[PDB]
């Protein structure tokens, strides 16, 4: 089963995909998500990506500490102390981001559904 897996799943009300874990198989292609912020919703398998971590060379949206957002490209993954960090390149410069600071826009997550989606 997919229960217990880390995924990146769409939040339908804004179209963005967020990291979380499947907690239940609701049936018929639907799954219960527990997002990493503690929000929970049912999500269709087609809107769930099996990528823990989000892949190298993927376009993502990085969250900066003052509620700004920007696109960047994943160039690294690191483990430090049981936690995942992403190295994100924007305009030739790389910066590190914690897992919750990296999300996918609708257009960024849709690109991945073929290879990673649970549809």
Curated annotation (Swiss-Prot):
Positions bearing the Glycyl lysine isopeptide (Lys-Gly) (interchain with G-Cter in SUMO2) cross-link: 79
Annotated effect of mutating residue 18 to A: Reduces affinity for histone H4 that has been dimethylated at 'Lys-20'
Annotated effect of mutating residue 16 to A: Reduces affinity for histone H4 that has been dimethylated at 'Lys-20'
Cross-link (Glycyl lysine isopeptide (Lys-Gly) (interchain with G-Cter in SUMO1)): 79
Modification comment: Asymmetrically dimethylated on Arg residues by PRMT1. Methylation is required for DNA binding.
Localisation per UniProt entry: Nucleus; Chromosome; Chromosome, Centromere, Kinetochore
Disease the record associates with this protein: A chromosomal aberration involving TP53BP1 is found in a form of myeloproliferative disorder chronic with eosinophilia. Translocation t(5;15)(q33;q22) with PDGFRB creating a TP53BP1-PDGFRB fusion protein.
Domain notes: The Tudor-like region mediates binding to histone H4 dimethylated at 'Lys-20' (H4K20me2). Interaction with NUDT16L1/TIRR masks the Tudor-like domain and prevents recruitment to chromatin. The UDR (ubiquitin-dependent recruitment) motif specifically recognizes and binds histone H2A monoubiquitinated at 'Lys-15' (H2AK15ub). Phosphorylation of the UDR blocks interaction with H2AK15ub.
Function per UniProt: Double-strand break (DSB) repair protein involved in response to DNA damage, telomere dynamics and class-switch recombination (CSR) during antibody genesis. Plays a key role in the repair of double-strand DNA breaks (DSBs) in response to DNA damage by promoting non-homologous end joining (NHEJ)-mediated repair of DSBs and specifically counteracting the function of the homologous recombination (HR) repair protein BRCA1. In response to DSBs, phosphorylation by ATM promotes interaction with RIF1 and dissociation from NUDT16L1/TIRR, leading to recruitment to DSBs sites.
Protein name: TP53-binding protein 1
Protein's organism: Homo sapiens (Human)
This protein's encoding gene: TP53BP1
